[PDB]
């Protein structure tokens, strides 16, 4: 089955084989399709198909609701009708069959998504938000006009929201192990802390296992242990912006006596049921208004250290120990001991079924 959309005038119709285009880091699945035109009533004699990657986002200074500013991050256009002699491209397996079914009035088009591009990520809107989704979302636009610079008509264009998604790698990586050693003032004996997750790659809804090992040799007593999972998102529109948001926190009242060890296993699970009110949280790309899980981590192109546009989502696990206060310095010093454990949170590669849109609709 393929997806088709028709213009309000009915003269233009475009066919897409899918809506999610998997990103393999080094290569991206091509965006192929077929455009059906009727030149008898079409006097413009030119048909243009445009793929656009835009960072749609609201405005706080403007009091108008719903209005957003559109900033294109990647724009590519290919003209289908009339067939361009220079734009000769091979036909995919699905593309050739669509031409045969429709007839001789259907012409193909094919785009190549370049690498080092953002994935479809939609920030969670607030309760008072009534406009379109905010974030990065691709779009396939088809229209007929005399020239590119000519004004576009609402009745003479079609648009489909497509997605660029990534899935969990087949090969697991090294186990994330991080340790710290804090040295105090009263005594030279250190306060050791170790933490290690079970595996690097976790799935959406799969529990996260944290192993905590505390080797206390100082004179102070640890009061509370805080374990949290935080979502790190990087936005690069005009300047790089870093912000954090905890999606799952669990506090334990475990107390470690001086000159004693400690060992425990903690289980955490990030989910959207308790994070509904956290405005600004990053979620996977929505089509229109569907419910989507937390944004999956983005697989960066090795250690290229490039400034990727759009939104880059990453996760970490923080283990924090609360140390008792008092003594000489009182409540002025900061004796808390913390350590961070990065991990990857994605989806397994689906076998046949692509991601769907609210399968049991209300």
């Amino acid at each position: 089955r393929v997806f088709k959309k028709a213009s309000p005038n009915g003269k233009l119709t475009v066919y897409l084989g899918k809506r999610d285009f998997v990103d393999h880091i080094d290569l991206v699945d091509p965006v192929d399709g077929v455009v059906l035109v009727d030149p008898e009533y079409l006097k413009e004699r030119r048909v243009y198909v445009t793929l656009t990657c835009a960072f749609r986002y609201g405005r706080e200074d403007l009091d108008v609701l719903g209005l957003t500013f559109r900033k294109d991050l990647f724009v590519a256009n290919v003209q289908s009708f009339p067939p361009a002699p220079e734009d000769k491209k091979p036909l995919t397996r699905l593309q050739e069959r669509l031409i045969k079914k429709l007839g001789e009035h259907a012409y193909p088009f094919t785009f190549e998504i370049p690498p080092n591009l953002p994935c479809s990520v939609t920030l969670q809107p607030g309760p008072e938000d009534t406009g379109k989704a905010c974030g990065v979302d691709y779009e396939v636009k088809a229209f007929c006009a005399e020239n590119l610079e000519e004004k576009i008509h609402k009745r003479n264009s079609v648009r489909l929201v497509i997605r660029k998604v990534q899935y969990a790698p087949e090969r697991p990586g090294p186990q994330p192990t991080a340790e710290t050693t804090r040295q105090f003032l009263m005594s030279d004996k250190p306060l050791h802390l170790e933490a290690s997750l079970d595996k690097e790659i976790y799935y959406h809804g799969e529990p996260i296992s944290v192993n905590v090992h505390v080797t206390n040799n100082t004179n102070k007593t640890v009061k509370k242990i805080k374990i949290s999972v935080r979502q790190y998102a990087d936005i690069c529109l005009f300047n790089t912006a870093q912000y954090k948001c905890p999606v799952a926190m669990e506090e334990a009242d475990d107390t470690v006596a001086p000159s004693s060890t400690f060992c425990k296993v903690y289980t955490l699970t990030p989910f959207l049921a308790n994070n509904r009110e956290k405005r600004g949280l990053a979620l996977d790309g929505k089509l229109k208004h569907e419910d989507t899980n937390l944004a999956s981590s983005t697989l960066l192109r090795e250690g290229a250290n490039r400034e990727i546009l759009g939104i880059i989502v990453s996760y970490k696990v923080k283990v924090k120990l609360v140390v008792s206060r008092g003594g000489l310095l009182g409540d002025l010093a900061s004796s808390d001991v913390a350590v961070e454990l990065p991990f990857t949170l994605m989806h397994p590669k689906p076998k046949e079924e692509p991601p769907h849109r609210e399968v049991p609709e209300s």
């Epitope: 809804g205 049921a273 609709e361």
Partner: antibody
Framework: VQLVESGGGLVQPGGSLRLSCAAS????????IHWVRQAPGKGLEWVAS????????YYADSVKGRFTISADTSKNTAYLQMNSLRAEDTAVYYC?????????????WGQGTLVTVSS | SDIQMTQSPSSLSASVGDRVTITCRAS??????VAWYQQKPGKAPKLLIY???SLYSGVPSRFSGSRSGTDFTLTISSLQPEDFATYYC?????????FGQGTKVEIKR
């Protein structure tokens, strides 16, 4: 991996019952747990559903307002609280599980529990 | 909205090695969100097909499904002796999830 439920039995009409489905082998955040009842000699019917990831619960129109479904994530168990049971509610109740990402049918089913409502 | 899934025939009989076809009709378009189950008497239903064409893992390849508009068909190539049970039709596109009436398959004498 196995779904086992307990709590069925004979209850007078207008009473209450508690069905507990102790899911083993998977969690409740990555799986959506459904309850399906089958009347003696009749076809299957869907009564309740819970999605712990999005915090959404659904009920059939016949059992709306009388049946309450909830999940205890601590021990991976889902409960079905029934109130004001009637004679037509006698059936065999099955506990079913479906993938949260994404729905692909009720692949895992419970062994079945029998609920009889008679005066 | 509610969807009434009319499953025909109500019951049929066939011999071993016969090709058996079962028709499931939906009152409204449900895309390709249809699943098939097999429930032997006394046991829990077993999932066979999901998305109306994808065979579930561990199911013998003799089972197959097809879609044509709103008509969904479950076809068994060779009627093995262990295929004699009741088959139900399901749709999971709209809440509530509605099942079919069920079809009984028995030996022929």
């Amino acid at each position: 991996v196995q779904l086992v439920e307990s709590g069925g039995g004979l209850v007078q009409p207008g009473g209450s019952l508690r069905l507990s489905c102790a899911a083993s082998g998977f969690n409740v955040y990555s799986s959506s747990i459904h309850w399906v009842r089958q009347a003696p000699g009749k076809g299957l019917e869907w009564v309740a559903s819970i999605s712990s990831y999005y915090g959404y619960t659904y009920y059939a129109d016949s059992v709306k307002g009388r049946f309450t479904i909830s999940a205890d994530t601590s021990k991976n168990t889902a409960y079905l609280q029934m109130n004001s049971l009637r004679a037509e509610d006698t059936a065999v109740y099955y506990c079913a599980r479906s993938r949260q990402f994404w729905y692909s049918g009720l692949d895992y089913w419970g062994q079945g529990t029998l609920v009889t409502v008679s005066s | 909205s509610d969807i009434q899934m009319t499953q025909s025939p109500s019951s049929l009989s066939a011999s071993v090695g016969d090709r058996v076809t079962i028709t499931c009709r939906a009152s409204q378009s449900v895309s390709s969100a249809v699943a098939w189950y097999q429930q032997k008497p006394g046991k829990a239903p077993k999932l066979l097909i999901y998305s109306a064409s994808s065979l579930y893992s561990g199911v013998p390849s003799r089972f197959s499904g097809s879609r044509s508009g709103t008509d969904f068909t479950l076809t068994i190539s060779s009627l093995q002796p262990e295929d004699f049970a009741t088959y139900y039709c399901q749709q999971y596109k709209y809440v509530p999830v509605t099942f079919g009436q069920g079809t009984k398959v028995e030996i022929k004498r």
